[PDB]
Design an enzyme around this catalytic site. Structure first.
Site, mmCIF file in Angstrom:
data_model
loop_
_atom_site.group_PDB
_atom_site.id
_atom_site.type_symbol
_atom_site.label_atom_id
_atom_site.label_comp_id
_atom_site.label_asym_id
_atom_site.label_seq_id
_atom_site.Cartn_x
_atom_site.Cartn_y
_atom_site.Cartn_z
ATOM 1 N N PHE A 44 47.956 37.027 40.354
ATOM 2 C CA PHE A 44 47.042 36.881 39.226
ATOM 3 C C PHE A 44 46.201 35.616 39.367
ATOM 4 O O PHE A 44 46.589 34.673 40.056
ATOM 5 C CB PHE A 44 47.825 36.843 37.912
ATOM 6 N N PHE A 46 45.656 33.638 37.046
ATOM 7 C CA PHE A 46 46.125 32.725 36.011
ATOM 8 C C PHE A 46 47.258 31.846 36.533
ATOM 9 O O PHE A 46 48.433 32.139 36.320
ATOM 10 C CB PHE A 46 46.596 33.509 34.784
#
EC number: 7.1.1.9
Length: 126
Positions: A44, A46
């Site tokens: 991801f 993030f």
């Protein structure tokens, strides 16, 4: 929309990376069949996370990649392996090697990305 059944399992960013096989790197390689190991991969945008990927030659390998909103995929030599599936749904590919070798590079992923996704990661164990 998200209502699987036959093949291919659909997941969500809810807690797919927080709880389950993608949650901890220890759940990466897990034997689920007679000679087929289940591999999990997550990536991801993030933060940051490891890439505990495995692929024992001789035995069947079922790679399972899933992301919230980012494509991963991987292109391994030996054969014209074409694996690429948008985020929000775990994929399932069956590809086994015959010898050891470390490879982690992305390219020719259908659309031919090259400024967004990440570099694949796979490791073979004798």
């Amino acid at each position: 929309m998200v209502i699987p059944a036959g093949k291919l399992e659909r997941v969500d960013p809810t807690t797919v990376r927080q709880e389950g096989p993608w949650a901890d790197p220890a759940q990466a390689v897990v034997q689920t069949g007679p000679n087929q190991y289940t591999v999990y991969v997550l990536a991801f945008a993030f933060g940051y996370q490891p890439n505990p990927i495995e692929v024992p030659q001789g035995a069947e390998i079922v790679f399972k990649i899933t992301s919230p909103d980012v494509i991963h995929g991987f292109h391994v030599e030996g054969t014209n392996i074409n694996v690429e599936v948008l985020p929000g749904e775990v994929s399932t590919v069956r590809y086994t090697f015959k010898r050891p070798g470390e490879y982690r590079i992305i390219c020719n992923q259908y659309c031919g990305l090259g400024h967004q996704n990440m570099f694949g990661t796979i490791v073979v164990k004798e």
